[PDB]
């Protein structure tokens, strides 16, 4: 019953500061423009201890499966090769990505009927809000 309130199909409904977050991460112009247009659907499922998060969009379909606290290799939608660890901290899914001596964190939280995604790199934060599909 780990992650129950996250499981489902979610659709992006608002974004703030994502272009700047992507700039901070190092994403180039053309990828920022096309990625920034996307309205992904995020599909979260759990089977035993394994959590799967899929994102589907016209930019780039992704899928990660993981066990909380157990590092895995991830190729991000912007083509970074990162080492990721996802944990639950006080009901918040915390997804840390390490690459080339850098770090970024993606937090996912249930707030009312929304799933709120906060992406932080150095001093730059982007907030992306999803609704049930
Ligand atoms: O909500 C997510 O899954 C999520 C937020 S940030 C991310 C990985 O980073 C990118 C993804 C697409 C374009 C540019 C970047 Cl930097 N995934």
From Swiss-Prot:
The modification Phosphotyrosine is found at residue 21. This is Fatty acid-binding protein, adipocyte. One of its GO terms (biological process) is cellular response to tumor necrosis factor. Forms a beta-barrel structure that accommodates hydrophobic ligands in its interior. It holds the Pfam family Lipocalin. Lipid transport protein in adipocytes. Binds both long chain fatty acids and retinoic acid. Delivers long-chain fatty acids and retinoic acid to their cognate receptors in the nucleus. Belongs to the calycin superfamily. Fatty-acid binding protein (FABP) family. It comes from the Eukaryota. InterPro entries: Calycin, Fatty_acid-bd, ILBP, Lipocln_cytosolic_FA-bd_dom. Changing residue 24 to D: In a breast cancer sample; somatic mutation. The modification Phosphoserine is found at residue 14. A motif (Nuclear localization signal) lies at residues 23-33. A fatty acid binds at residues 128-130. The gene is FABP4. Keywords: Acetylation, Cytoplasm, Lipid-binding, Nucleus, Phosphoprotein, Transport. The modification N-acetylcysteine is found at residue 3. Monomer. Homodimer. Interacts with PPARG. GO terms for cellular component: cytoplasm; cytosol; extracellular exosome; lipid droplet; nucleus. It is found in: Cytoplasm; Nucleus.
């Amino acid at each position: 019953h780990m992650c129950d309130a996250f499981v489902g199909t979610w659709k992006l409904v608002s974004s703030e500061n994502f272009d700047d977050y992507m700039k901070e991460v190092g994403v180039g112009f053309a990828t920022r423009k096309v990625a920034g247009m996307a309205k992904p659907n995020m599909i979260i499922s759990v089977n035993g201890d394994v959590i799967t998060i899929k994102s589907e969009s016209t930019f780039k379909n992704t899928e990660i499966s993981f066990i909380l606290g157990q590092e895995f290799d991830e190729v991000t939608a912007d083509d970074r090769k990162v080492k990721s660890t996802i944990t639950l901290d006080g009901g918040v899914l915390v997804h840390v990505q390490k690459w080339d001596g850098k770090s970024t964190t993606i937090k996912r939280k249930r707030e009312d009927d929304k799933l709120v995604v906060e992406c932080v790199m150095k001093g730059v934060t982007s907030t992306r809000v999803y609704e049930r599909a």
